RNA sequence: ACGAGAACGCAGCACCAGCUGUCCAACCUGAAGAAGA
């Protein structure tokens, strides 16, 4: 079946995992966070969050050293983020989501 | 008894690494705790 793991995350110091500098030139800086396209709210990328995920995870599943490729560094990483190695077609077990900012209206 | 039937343009990938919001600059100048008769 399928599970949905909840949570919140709570930025303890300024966070920048953006990478978009798109849309109006309305005094933006030249280095913007990623925001929603719609809503215009910081967001958190699902791409970011498992490459930094994936990574923390193999590094101390190894332990310690990550230098192999994605594909090749460990059964428990593999089934967990996917591995798309040409005969051997893990499929990820998690499926990360974008993230928006939540708490809009406390700030 | 439809050039048709069946077929996810899909799988893995951190917008990331390095970088002091720093340098120079007196809170300063003048002034009787003093005078009737």
């Avoid at 599970?3 to 966070?15: A, H, N, P, Q």
């Avoid at 995870?57 to 967990?80: H, T």
């Avoid at 051997?88 to 077990?93: E, G, H, L, S």
Wanted: glycine share 8%; no cysteine; aromatic share 4%.
């Amino acid at each position: 079946m399928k599970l949905v793991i909840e949570g919140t995350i709570v930025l303890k110091t300024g966070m920048h995992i953006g990478g978009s500098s798109d849309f109006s030139a309305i005094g933006a800086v030249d280095s913007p966070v990623v925001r929603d396209t719609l809503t215009r709210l910081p967001l958190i990328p699902g791409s970011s969050l498992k490459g930094k995920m994936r990574y923390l995870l193999a590094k101390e599943l190894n332990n310690g050293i990550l230098l192999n490729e994605p594909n090749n560094d460990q059964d428990e990483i593999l089934r967990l983020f996917g591995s798309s190695e040409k005969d051997k077609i893990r499929r990820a077990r998690l499926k990360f989501n974008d993230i928006k900012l939540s708490n809009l209206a406390e700030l």
